[model samples]
Target: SLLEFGKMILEETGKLAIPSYSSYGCYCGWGGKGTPKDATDRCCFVHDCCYGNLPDCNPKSDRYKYKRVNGAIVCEKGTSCENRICECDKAAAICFRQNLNTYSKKYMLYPDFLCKGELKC
Candidate 1:
């Protein structure tokens, strides 16, 4: 039951962490470019930039890898970047939740928001 509950929260946080207003959408793989279209998306943008400040952090690098503990994501210790990255993600997630207002309508099939980063505007 505890594990299930943990998973549910992760699912919720995962959803809230992304903002459809921006092309980045939490990036899923990396800290994408272009501007964040909304406050929540900006929060993640900040987190992504934080990773850039580290020595060598990236999705394909072992330094940025993580493991799940009881359904919670845990960064590997001793990487020297783990603590700060975790802190960045934690705050960004909190920031996004604070601005969770859906300007996009549901369409589970909905995916108008794609990788179209640059804007004509």
Candidate 2:
């Protein structure tokens, strides 16, 4: 998808300086609150506005997230919320992918660069 493609973009260029978690306008948390710069931003805006967790969901394992649904393992069915959440994400991803031209690397993050280290002992 667009994100997979986006992933390749960042992976290609590493060794770049990486909190990247501040959530700017129409970017992350309050992105929904702030006005989208364009259709892309607006797409994420609605996505955030529409957009969390599950039972037996081990923090250790990233499986609803599973052993691979198509494979031997299964992601296991999640609550209705996950379905909606998944759907919204799909839409948002498509939106961004389509407008990737507008997606400036100026703000685009390197993905999963933080959060885990903050709580480590």
Candidate 3:
């Protein structure tokens, strides 16, 4: 009788030992799960400096001033500065006039690249 009872308890314990689990997909920097508002599936990677004039920001120094967006400052010219802002990404940003006329990967400045701003995964 003792052996039969021990075998029954062991079988019950083995059944309960089977595991079950579940999980959901997630996007980095996004509040909710699944797709994000911008539809950018990947994470925030590079952040580039873009240029544009803000009506609220009055002309204190130059006709327009360098505006930092996301975390980068614009490097375009004309609308912002005198020299044109060159990059490997979107439109020109601030005037790197003090630096080189063009941006090269070899002669690039620290934190200064032609890449654009993005989220990380």
Candidate 4:
């Protein structure tokens, strides 16, 4: 899966420079809003894959924005490509592509740089 692949890179690079968390300080709150909730602070919301403790990106805050795409609530900048599908903030795959003329960039599982000098699946 994409998450597994991404994890390998995250491990080797010893880096966690995800664009999504560049400005959220470094701890992703995972309670999903409201009180008596728990924020994992570790895991990419898109992949649900453990990325360790990261940062929180609030849509209402200056750092982000929320848009309703398809039926899933997506939090991203208005700059995202909202075509036939819902493009996630950073996740390679778009949301709810199972029933449209669209597909997630999930095929973009590999980073742009790595696409060179190798054959991808």
Candidate 5:
């Protein structure tokens, strides 16, 4: 049976032979030391969800600073606020209530531009 199977495998049919190859250039979870073993010319691996493809931001810039607040990481006061990176404005609810202090029952009913800054109750 083994000899028969081998003979059958060796027999070539009148069909065209086909060849295939992999096109994947890079892996998903490798980065940071300049290069890895599987590194390619056009495809560099991005290790995580946000690290590889994000806008360039200066960490040491005076425009913004990272600080810990109540066991959470937060952008400090007077920093630029926008999108996923900066959520400083979300804390405005508490700030408004404290600054206004019962002047308005609606609570955070005004725009961020108007409510920001010192407002007497």
Candidate 6:
């Protein structure tokens, strides 16, 4: 039973880690699925969604980097750029993060927000 469960997890994880251009249709709220009509807007949407909030990237550090973990290219700070090393995903990695390789949605421990770094820390 445990082996069967593990196999199922592996298969499902593979699915969520891939990209999904289809989810970005007109009704998809963000609407950045790469069409010629709203191409600029779409591009901006993608930029914001993927790489906007990064606080530790610049030309000085040369740390502008990302990777497709699951269905999205997760943009991170220094971690995303340098040598492209990914952290271990033990407790932090759910089926989503395991499959996608992207960071998991921020979770809470007591009052502190448990992050990717903390998982390995």
Which candidate wins on lDDT? 1
Q: Which pairs clash (backbone N, Cα, C closer than 3 Å) in model 2?
A: 26-31, 63-66
Span of 10 residues, lowest total lDDT, candidate 1: 1-10
Q: Scored by CA lDDT, what does every candidate get?
A: 0.45, 0.38, 0.24, 0.27, 0.25, 0.28
Task: Give the least accurate 10-residue stretch of model 6, judged by summed lDDT.
Answer: 112-121
| Model 2 CA deviation exceeding 4 Å by range | 1-24, 52-77, 106-121
- Best by the TM-score measure: 1
| Alpha carbon deviation, residue 78, candidate 6 (Å) | 8.8
Q: Mind giving the per-residue lDDT tens digits that candidate 2 earns over 9-104? A: 233222121222124234443323333545554554565554423343222122122223342222235665444444454455456556656655
lDDT value for candidate 5? 0.25
- Per the 3 Å backbone cut-off, how many clashing residue pairs does candidate 5 have? 0
Count of clashes, each model: 1, 2, 12, 6, 0, 4
Error in Å for residue 36 of model 3? 46
What digit string (tens of lDDT, one per residue) describes model 5 on residues 88-118? 2223212222333222222112222322222
lDDT of 1 by residue, 51-90 (tens): 5666565422323334567855565564555556555554
TM-score of every model?
Answer: 0.48, 0.45, 0.15, 0.18, 0.20, 0.20
lDDT of 6: 0.28
Please state the error at residue 64 of candidate 3 in Å: 5.8
Candidate 4 global TM-score: 0.18
Judged by whole-model lDDT over C-alpha atoms, candidate 1 comes out at 0.45
Q: What would the per-residue lDDT of candidate 6 be over residues 1-121, giving only the tens digit for each residue?
A: 1222222224444433112211222211222233322232232243333333344533223433434476444534554433232121111123233324432222111111211121100
Assess candidate 3 and give its lDDT. Answer: 0.24
Q: Where in model 5 is the C-alpha error above 4 Å?
A: 1-47, 55-64, 77-121
Writing each residue's lDDT as its tens digit, candidate 3 over 1-121 gives 1222222223322211111000101221112233322211121111111222323322223332234468454544554332222221122111221112332223112122222344333
How far in Å is the alpha carbon of 19 misplaced in model 4? Answer: 25
Off by over 4 Å in 4: 1-63, 75-121
